[PDB]
Amino acid sequence: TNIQGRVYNFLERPTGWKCFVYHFTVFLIVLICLIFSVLSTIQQYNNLATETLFWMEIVLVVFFGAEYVVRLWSAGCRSKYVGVWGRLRFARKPISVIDLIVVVASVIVLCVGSAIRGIRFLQILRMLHVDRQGGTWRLLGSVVFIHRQELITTLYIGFLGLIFSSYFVYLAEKDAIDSSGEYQFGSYADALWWGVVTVTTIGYGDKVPQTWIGKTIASCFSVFAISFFALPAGILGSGFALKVQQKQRQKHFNRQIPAAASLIQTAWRCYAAENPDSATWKIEHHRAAIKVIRRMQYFVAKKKFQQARKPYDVRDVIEQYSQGHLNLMVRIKELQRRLDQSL
């Protein structure tokens, strides 16, 4: 029966309407819980909310436990996760682990209990549940990896600038007391903090350079530093845009098939090659040659598969042209030979 598979689909990797709705509902519930927690946190609505939380939180945790159990049960759909070991492996995955932590911690809290310190934290953690299959994070991670060389540089140089600016401001404004009667840059730590604020472009204004020289230095070292700090946001965005554009001009999925098949076949052939008295030895020196040829074919096949996987590009076009052109040339040569042969 296909029921387990269906269940798995519903729970993890869902494109279903009903499934989507369910997920949305869950998210909403989580949000509501968070809101309630927040309300409890402020003193004016503490006595009324605690009881409600006690009533609801336990139920929520039970529900989540049930869901987890169901998910575990459903793992058998995927052949990667079969038996006990497979299930353990599945559990090992990050989101699942997080969920487990949330549930067990919640249970512990309940046992301890209607005040609770860690419950708030658990609630916060819970919001991470909805990003199933790591589809949110993974993309971002990939993008970061792609643009790491530049991003890292930006982080570094900017950081250095910030440090330097902080130092300079400390040097400037050590002696200068504020109008309110308190030293703004007593410690270097304070200066550093100020610098961080400035580069961030938050501009709290708890600390501001008092001396004219200090002001001048801030003016000098701000703009560049600001630009540097803004860079990551920009660059990442650009990368994302580029990725989207690339996606927009992807190959069709049908073109990947034959190449893949070929690759598989070549792999099989290679495998056979080791086995001396196999069926694939159909159609010593000769054998050796054949092995080499098979390996070559496999290599070709892999390359082809990779190409298929990738999006369309100028290089691909060039390759295609080359392939065409050589063939045409060969044909022409053959024709010429035929002509010569006749005469």
Partner: protein
């Protein structure tokens, strides 16, 4: 590795078809013909290109050695194979229909003979169920 290198050299010599020690496409084609596959010139070119280190339309002995060096059952290689398998696997699981697999082998890509396909099936499906575990197969390979 001395013995291995000697063996490789021997192989190269038998392939070469000449004292130059530089494999052209023509030599490769000749070799193929001797086997009796009868390949296209484009195909031959493709084969050489992957091999070629210098990228000059001729397989050097060092190039040949290099190609021999990079071994299968390396993790990077495996991933590609897995991806390929997935491409043909409906229901987004580590499972494919045996009959379907057979059909694909027969038809799509570099066609595989009936006997060969049977052998493959035997290798893969230890259990009597047609839903064959491709991941396991890949691991075995």
């Amino acid at each position: 590795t001395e013995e291995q290198i000697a063996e490789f050299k021997e192989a190269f010599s038998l392939f070469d078809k000449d004292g130059d020690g530089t494999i052209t496409t023509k030599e490769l084609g000749t070799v193929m013909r001797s086997l009796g596959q009868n390949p296209t010139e484009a195909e031959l070119q493709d084969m050489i290109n992957e091999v070629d280190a210098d990228g000059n339309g001729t397989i050097d002995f060092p190039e040949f050695l290099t190609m021999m060096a990079r071994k299968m059952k390396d993790t990077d290689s495996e991933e590609e194979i897995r991806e390929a398998f997935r491409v043909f696997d409906k229901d987004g699981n580590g499972y494919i229909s045996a009959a379907e697999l057979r059909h694909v082998m027969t038809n799509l890509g570099e066609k595989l003979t009936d006997e060969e396909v049977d052998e493959m099936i035997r290798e893969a499906d230890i259990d009597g169920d047609g839903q064959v575990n491709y991941e396991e197969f890949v691991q075995m390979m």
